[PDB]
Enzyme design. Structure first.
Site, PDB file in Angstrom:
ATOM      1  N   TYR A  60       8.487   3.544   4.728  1.00  0.00           N
ATOM      2  CA  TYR A  60       7.777   4.866   5.300  1.00  0.00           C
ATOM      3  C   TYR A  60       6.350   4.345   5.305  1.00  0.00           C
ATOM      4  O   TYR A  60       5.334   4.621   4.456  1.00  0.00           O
ATOM      5  CB  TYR A  60       7.719   6.249   5.720  1.00  0.00           C
ATOM      6  CG  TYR A  60       7.361   6.729   6.642  1.00  0.00           C
ATOM      7  CD1 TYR A  60       7.325   6.030   8.220  1.00  0.00           C
ATOM      8  CD2 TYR A  60       6.772   7.970   6.471  1.00  0.00           C
ATOM      9  CE1 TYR A  60       7.190   7.384   9.316  1.00  0.00           C
ATOM     10  CE2 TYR A  60       6.030   8.361   7.229  1.00  0.00           C
ATOM     11  CZ  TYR A  60       6.325   8.311   8.627  1.00  0.00           C
ATOM     12  OH  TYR A  60       6.162   8.762   9.898  1.00  0.00           O
ATOM     13  N   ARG A  88       1.096   2.620  11.599  1.00  0.00           N
ATOM     14  CA  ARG A  88       2.194   3.965  11.582  1.00  0.00           C
ATOM     15  C   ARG A  88       1.734   4.509  12.499  1.00  0.00           C
ATOM     16  O   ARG A  88       1.118   5.605  12.708  1.00  0.00           O
ATOM     17  CB  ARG A  88       2.306   4.054  10.081  1.00  0.00           C
ATOM     18  CG  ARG A  88       3.845   4.391   9.363  1.00  0.00           C
ATOM     19  CD  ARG A  88       4.011   5.453   8.396  1.00  0.00           C
ATOM     20  NE  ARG A  88       3.114   6.819   8.114  1.00  0.00           N
ATOM     21  CZ  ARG A  88       2.915   7.199   7.194  1.00  0.00           C
ATOM     22  NH1 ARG A  88       3.366   6.563   5.350  1.00  0.00           N
ATOM     23  NH2 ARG A  88       2.503   8.674   6.484  1.00  0.00           N
ATOM     24  N   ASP A  89       3.147   5.384  13.161  1.00  0.00           N
ATOM     25  CA  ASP A  89       3.094   5.996  13.815  1.00  0.00           C
ATOM     26  C   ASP A  89       2.790   5.917  15.202  1.00  0.00           C
ATOM     27  O   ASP A  89       1.955   7.099  15.446  1.00  0.00           O
ATOM     28  CB  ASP A  89       3.160   7.453  13.487  1.00  0.00           C
ATOM     29  CG  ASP A  89       3.630   7.656  12.154  1.00  0.00           C
ATOM     30  OD1 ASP A  89       5.094   7.630  12.014  1.00  0.00           O
ATOM     31  OD2 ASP A  89       3.223   7.827  10.987  1.00  0.00           O
ATOM     32  N   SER A 105      -3.687   9.080  13.780  1.00  0.00           N
ATOM     33  CA  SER A 105      -3.378   8.279  12.633  1.00  0.00           C
ATOM     34  C   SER A 105      -3.547   8.785  11.364  1.00  0.00           C
ATOM     35  O   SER A 105      -3.147   9.907  11.292  1.00  0.00           O
ATOM     36  CB  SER A 105      -4.418   6.490  12.201  1.00  0.00           C
ATOM     37  OG  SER A 105      -5.844   7.112  11.499  1.00  0.00           O
ATOM     38  N   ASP A 158      10.519   6.270  12.693  1.00  0.00           N
ATOM     39  CA  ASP A 158       8.967   6.438  14.027  1.00  0.00           C
ATOM     40  C   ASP A 158       8.981   5.131  13.989  1.00  0.00           C
ATOM     41  O   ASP A 158       7.360   4.664  14.111  1.00  0.00           O
ATOM     42  CB  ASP A 158       8.398   7.763  13.383  1.00  0.00           C
ATOM     43  CG  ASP A 158       7.181   7.726  14.439  1.00  0.00           C
ATOM     44  OD1 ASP A 158       8.144   7.397  15.779  1.00  0.00           O
ATOM     45  OD2 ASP A 158       5.994   7.675  14.168  1.00  0.00           O
ATOM     46  N   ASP A 191       5.846  19.266   8.231  1.00  0.00           N
ATOM     47  CA  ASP A 191       5.132  17.666   9.085  1.00  0.00           C
ATOM     48  C   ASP A 191       4.197  17.369   9.417  1.00  0.00           C
ATOM     49  O   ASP A 191       3.909  16.843   9.762  1.00  0.00           O
ATOM     50  CB  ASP A 191       6.549  17.749  11.185  1.00  0.00           C
ATOM     51  CG  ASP A 191       7.862  18.522  10.487  1.00  0.00           C
ATOM     52  OD1 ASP A 191       8.292  16.693   9.413  1.00  0.00           O
ATOM     53  OD2 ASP A 191       8.308  18.712  11.011  1.00  0.00           O
TER      54      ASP A 191
END
Length: 358
Positions: A83, A88-89, A95, A135, A313
């Site tokens: 991950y 990312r995401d 970010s 994700d 989260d």
């Protein structure tokens, strides 16, 4: 399939989650609830390699697993999440993650993979199962209108390919993240999702170590719902088993008889969301079905706990540079600390609301 990665192996229990759980349980005041909380440390979870900073931990877990297997006569299995994609995401607000496409992100990511491979190579008597990039690819199905995702598409594909190709060289069993029923399980998203995952599998050489897909990672859906959650209206695939039953034959027709793993670590309580897309620290979640290969489906190798319940989260503090407004919705537990850090009140409720009970 014939070869379920878990059969015949003992899962290595994360000492990091175990330490978080032990410290958490000591703060729970009701003795009965405290003892139930402590027992969570005996439930296998996935270790998230969310930064290069996590790689030394991986090495310690591999070596510890190797020694534990020798001490108990068992073959040990270490569960990891890859991950750390650049950008990312891509569809999330704000970010996160240490790598960026603009700053050699792909090259940095491939060095991150190389460091992981270099650890795994040293411990051939330990099996590794990896979830590949939550994700990520799912955004390339539904979210190409998000400009950050459109601009990340080639990097996500190249990086996931590098991970699959190089982890296969050290025999890692791999499940690519595939969102959940409310993301890719919509009937109209099934075929686009199958086409993307098959292209990814083809580019990585169709390695037999690429076993299939992971679903519901860090989410809250039922595997088999007693009745549809109201958030699912319009989607006949209202739980993970419907999604998987619908997707698997499309992969099979492409020559990939894919199998699946399903996160249930925060699925004990259904009907807790106002909208299906709400993902951050959902209030009232409970620990769900414990990991098991007794999955109820031909397609599913294991129910797993991928996201470790109790690790936040994301923060609800709108002044944080990492703030995602999803983490302040009426259904998000607040106040919440930064992502990945321990969220004690949330953990206590996960324990109290566990279903099946602990």
């Amino acid at each position: 399939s014939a070869n379920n990665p878990w059969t015949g192996f003992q899962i290595f229990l994360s000492p990091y989650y175990a330490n978080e759980v032990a410290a958490a349980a000591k703060q729970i005041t009701d003795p009965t609830l405290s003892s139930k909380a402590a027992s969570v440390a005996n439930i296998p979870t996935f270790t998230w390699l969310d930064s290069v900073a996590k790689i030394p931990d991986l090495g310690t877990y591999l070596a510890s697993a190797s020694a534990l297997g020798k001490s108990t006569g068992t073959k040990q299995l270490v569960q990891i999440v890859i991950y750390d994609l650049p950008d990312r995401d891509c569809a999330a607000k704000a970010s996160n993650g240490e790598f960026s496409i603009a700053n050699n992100g792909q090259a940095n990511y491939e060095n991150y993979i190389d460091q992981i491979v270099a650890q795994i190579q040293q411990f051939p008597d330990v099996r590794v199962v990896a979830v590949i990039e939550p994700d990520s690819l799912a955004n390339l199905v539904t979210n190409l209108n998000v400009q950050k995702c459109a601009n990340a598409k080639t990097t996500y594909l190249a990086c996931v390919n590098y991970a699959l190709t190089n982890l296969a060289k050290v025999g890692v069993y791999m499940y690519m993240d595939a969102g959940h029923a409310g993301w890719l399980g919509w009937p109209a998203n099934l075929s686009p999702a199958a086409q993307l995952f098959t292209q990814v599998w083809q580019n990585a050489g169709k390695s037999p170590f690429i076993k299939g897909l992971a679903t519901n990672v860090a989410n809250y859906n039922a595997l088999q719902a007693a009745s549809p959650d109201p958030i699912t209206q319009g989607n006949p695939n209202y739980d993970e088993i419907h999604y998987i039953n619908a997707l698997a034959p499309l992969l099979q027709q492409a020559g990939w008889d894919a199998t699946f793993i399903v996160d249930q670590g925060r699925s004990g309580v259904q009907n807790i969301r106002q909208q299906w897309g709400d993902w951050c620290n959902i209030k009232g979640a409970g620990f769900g079905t414990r990991p098991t290969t007794n999955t109820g489906s031909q397609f599913i190798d294991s129910i797993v706990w991928v996201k470790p319940g109790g690790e936040c989260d994301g923060t609800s503090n709108s002044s944080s540079p990492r703030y995602d407004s999803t983490c302040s919705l009426p259904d998000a537990a607040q106040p919440a600390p930064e992502a990945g850090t321990w969220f004690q009140a949330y953990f206590q409720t996960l324990v109290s609301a566990a279903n099946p009970p602990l």
